[PDB]
Each structure stands twice: as C-alpha cells, then as structure tokens.
Amino acid sequence: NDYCQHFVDTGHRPQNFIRDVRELIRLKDELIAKSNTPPMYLQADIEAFDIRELTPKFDVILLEPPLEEYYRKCWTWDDIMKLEIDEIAAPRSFIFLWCGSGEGLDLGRVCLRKWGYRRCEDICWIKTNKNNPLDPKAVFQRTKEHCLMGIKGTVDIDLIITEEPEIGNIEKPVEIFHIIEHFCLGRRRLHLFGRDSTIRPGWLTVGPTLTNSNYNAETYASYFSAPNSYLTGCTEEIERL
Amino acid sequence: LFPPQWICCDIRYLDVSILGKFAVVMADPPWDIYGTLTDDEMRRLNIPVLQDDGFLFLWVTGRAMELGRECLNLWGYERVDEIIWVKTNQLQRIIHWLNHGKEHCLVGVKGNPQGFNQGLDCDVIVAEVRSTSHKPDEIYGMIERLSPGTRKIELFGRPHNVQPNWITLGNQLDGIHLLDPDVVARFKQRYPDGIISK
Numbered sequence: 001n002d003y004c005q006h007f008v009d010t011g012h013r014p015q016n017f018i019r020d021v022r023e024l025i026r027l028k029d030e031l032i033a034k035s036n037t038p039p040m041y042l043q044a045d046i047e048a049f050d051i052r053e054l055t056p057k058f059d060v061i062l063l064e065p066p067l068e069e070y071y072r073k074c075w076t077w078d079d080i081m082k083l084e085i086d087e088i089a090a091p092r093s094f095i096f097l098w099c100g101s102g103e104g105l106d107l108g109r110v111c112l113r114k115w116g117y118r119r120c121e122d123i124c125w126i127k128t129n130k131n132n133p134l135d136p137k138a139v140f141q142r143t144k145e146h147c148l149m150g151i152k153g154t155v156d157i158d159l160i161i162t163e164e165p166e167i168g169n170i171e172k173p174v175e176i177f178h179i180i181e182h183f184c185l186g187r188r189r190l191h192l193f194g195r196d197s198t199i200r201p202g203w204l205t206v207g208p209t210l211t212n213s214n215y216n217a218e219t220y221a222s223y224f225s226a227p228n229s230y231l232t233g234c235t236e237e238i239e240r241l
Numbered sequence: 242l243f244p245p246q247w248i249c250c251d252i253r254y255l256d257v258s259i260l261g262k263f264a265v266v267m268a269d270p271p272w273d274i275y276g277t278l279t280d281d282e283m284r285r286l287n288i289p290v291l292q293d294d295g296f297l298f299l300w301v302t303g304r305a306m307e308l309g310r311e312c313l314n315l316w317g318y319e320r321v322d323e324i325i326w327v328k329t330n331q332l333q334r335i336i337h338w339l340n341h342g343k344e345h346c347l348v349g350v351k352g353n354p355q356g357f358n359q360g361l362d363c364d365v366i367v368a369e370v371r372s373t374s375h376k377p378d379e380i381y382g383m384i385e386r387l388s389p390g391t392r393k394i395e396l397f398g399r400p401h402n403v404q405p406n407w408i409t410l411g412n413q414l415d416g417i418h419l420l421d422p423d424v425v426a427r428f429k430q431r432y433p434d435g436i437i438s439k
C-alpha cells in the first residue's frame with residue numbers, strides 16, 4: 001500500500017499512518033529532574049544584546065530563531081549567521097538549531113560550521129494532519145521541520161511526530177527538550193529565542209518576548225561551582241554538610 | 242522510449258553525453274562515509290551534461306548530508322526540498338547519538354522547469370524497509386506524478402530499480418539494454434565495439 005498515492009487521493013499525510021507515534025528511562029528522567037538547576041530566564045533583544053554578557057559558557061545551546069516561514073519581528077538567516085554563538089559555547093558543547101523546512105537546511109549548516117560545530121544528527125519533526133486532511137521553489141508539500149544537532153570539541157530516535165499545530169502557533173514540540181536532556185551533556189543549558197511558555201527547569205531561557213527576568217550571572221554561575229562543575233545532569237546530587 | 246532501459250557500466254568512465262537530456266535525475270551514490278567513490282570522484286561526475294531544466298534526487302546519509310549538498314551545488318543545482326523516508330515494518334511501526342528512523346533524499350533544481358506538477362506529493366515517505374540499501378518504490382510514483390511521461394535517468398541503480406521511462410546505470414546490471422533509437426545510435430558511434438573503458 002502506497003501512502004504517497006493515498007495522500008494524493010485523500011490529503012492524509014503518510015505520517016498519519018505511523019503507529020505508536022527497557023522501562024528504566026524513567027529513573028533517568030528522575031535524575032535529570034533532581035540535578036536540574038532552577039529555571040532562569042532573561043528578557044533581551046538578542047539583535048542588540050551583547051551575547052558575551054551570558055556566562056558561563058554553555059554545554060548545550062538550543063537556538064530557535066523566529067523564521068519568516070513560521071508565519072503563514074522575524075529573523076533572517078542573514079541575522080542568525082551574524083550571532084556570535086561561538087563566544088558563549090563551551091569548548092566541548094552541543095547546539096540544537098531549528099532550521100525550518102526551506103533554505104535553513106543549508107544556511108543552518110553554514111551557521112554550524114561558522115560557529116565551530118560539525119553536524120552529528122538531523123532531527124526531523126514530522127507533522128501529521130489527522131485533524132485536517134506553497135513556497136515558490138518547493139517541489140513538494142512541506143510537512144516537517146529540521147532541528148540540526150552540532151557538536152564541538154571532544155535511547156532516542158531522530159524523529160518527533162506530532163499533529164501540525166494551529167496556524168500562527170510557532171511552538172516547537174517539547175519532545176526536543178526530552179531528546180536533549182536524555183543525552184546527559186552537562187547542566188549549562190541555554191535556549192535562545194525561548195518564550196514565557198518555554199521556560200523550563202534545568203534551562204536558562206533568553207528572548208525578546210519574555211515578560212519577566214530573574215537572570216543573575218553570579219547566581220547562575222553558583223549552580224556549577226565545585227563540587228558540581230562537570231556533572232552530566234544525569235547523576236545524583238553531591239552530598240553537602 | 243517507454244520500457245525500462247539500462248547500461249551496466251562504471252559510472253566514473255561512461256560518456257554520459259550520449260544519453261541526451263532528462264527531466265529528472267536520481268542518484269544513490271556509494272558515498273565514502275564495497276565499490277565506493279572518493280569525494281573527488283563524486284565531484285567530477287559529469288552530472289552537468291544530463292539536464293538543462295529539471296530536478297535531481299540525491300540520496301544522502303552521514304557526512305554525505307553535507308558532501309551531497311556540495312556536489313549538488315558544484316553540479317549547478319540549488320537544493321529546494323528534502324524528502325525523508327520514514328522506515329517502518331509491515332505493521333507501520335518505526336524501525337551515533339540517536340537511532341536513525343529515516344533516510345534523506347535531497348531535491349535539487351536546475352534551470353527553470355516548466356510543466357511539472359509541483360505540490361502533488363508531500364516530503365515524507367512512510368514505507369516498509371525491504372532489502373538492505375533498497376530505496377522505496379514510492380519515490381518513482383512521486384517522480385512520475387511530478388513529471389509524467391518524461392525521460393528519467395537513475396545513477397547507481399540495481400536491477401530491481403529498472404522502470405519504464407527510466408534509463409538505469411550501475412555496475413551490477415545485466416549488460417546493456419537500450420531501445421531509444423537516438424540513444425542506440427549515439428551509443429554505437431561512441432562505443433562501436435560495445436566496450437566502455439578509460
């Protein structure tokens with residue numbers, strides 16, 4: 001049975017027919033939650049903000065620039081490529097870059113190389129249209145977004161399947177945080193262009209639409225001072241007193 | 242000429258200028274990530290002669306996600322879409338840092354194709370994995386709906402890949418099977434003894 005033909009016949013995307021969209025990966029979930037730092041967050045216009053003010057250097061950076069394609073203040077790949085991401089990434093670190101579905105698949109790769117990463121995974125967010133069975137260069141109907149994973153220095157599948165959000169909803173699937181956190185990459189986690197709705201324990205969220213800030217560089221750094229400097233985020237607390 | 246055609250050959254050494262122009266090219270190269278091609282051999286493939294206006298479908302994995310984009314651009318294409326095939330078992334369940342549930346196929350455009358049916362299919366294929374390295378048959382139907390009745394060429398195909406409207410090239414095909422008279426004629430001129438060397 002040919003779900004591509006079926007999509008042409010009915011408008012139901014082939015991904016609508018994927019089924020099921022260990023057991024100890026829950027104790028790991030619990031360890032992540034225990035070692036998570038308090039959520040921290042800062043309202044900042046990133047185009048005007050000096051990124052170096054954000055210390056210390058991060059083990060993982062989630063970068064979610066509001067692309068024009070997300071809408072039926074937008075950032076172009078021109079603006080994104082000029083971010084000084086390498087000035088705040090730790091020498092060993094990871095980046096997760098939401099690239100959309102168009103030119104970003106190429107320009108996001110340029111950005112990764114520009115900032116000193118190599119791409120190690122291509123995570124595809126496949127959007128189903130079960131509830132509801134156009135770019136001029138497009139050859140096909142675009143039904144997915146890519147989040148590229150980059151590594152610099154020295155359990156999960158690479159797919160996320162959810163229903164296509166309502167038009168004008170720019171949110172990305174929260175599943176991406178689960179994939180990232182399950183890697184156990186360290187505890188200094190930055191989300192650029194996050195929002196009030198994405199603030200999360202274990203994460204420093206920075207973005208222009210935050211309504212409130214609680215970020216203090218010295219407070220933030222105190223979460224990773226010895227004995228806690230090198231934890232993965234997947235291990236027990238270190239006993240004190 | 243509608244029925245399947247194919248040439249057993251070393252794609253490095255074949256003079257592809259005898260094949261004419263094609264509306265769609267598809268390649269599934271043996272990337273060096275066995276019979277592979279070095280990066281430089283891939284770059285020097287004479288893809289530019291195969292089309293004037295049309296689409297290239299280029300399977301990529303690992304670091305060929307980047308190297309394939311390079312080849313695509315060097316050969317004169319812009320990448321305008323990216324198909325993924327989600328690999329399922331027969332019950333529609335999905336099969337370094339992450340386990341891989343999908344294969345990628347870059348879609349490049351050259352020139353300004355006119356009269357293609359853009360937007361008929363979407364960029365996700367959901368299909369059962371079969372033999373190793375075997376691409377899903379859905380791609381041919383997608384390509385047929387996109388460009389019905391036009392000439393197409395597949396590089397590094399295998400015998401199971403032969404299709405009407407397609408000429409298939411690969412070194413595990415059974416001999417040479419050409420029916421298009423334009424092609425037959427140019428093949429005889431270029432290869433009067435039927436041999437493809439150097």
Ligand SMILES: O=C(NC[C@]1(O)CCCN(c2cc(NCc3ccccc3)ncn2)C1)c1ccc(CN2CC3(CCCC3)C2)cc1
Pocket residue numbers: 250251252253269270271275276277278300302344373374375376377397398399410411412413414
């Ligand atoms: O099996 C294959 N394809 C037929 C050949 O025939 C085999 C043998 C070399 N190959 C050649 C090579 C060649 N020239 C150079 C040469 C010749 C002799 C020795 C060394 C080098 N000329 C013609 N065919 C192709 C093949 C196998 C895996 C992949 C990878 N994809 C990823 C997917 C999986 C899901 C869809 C996409 C498969 C691609 C193709």
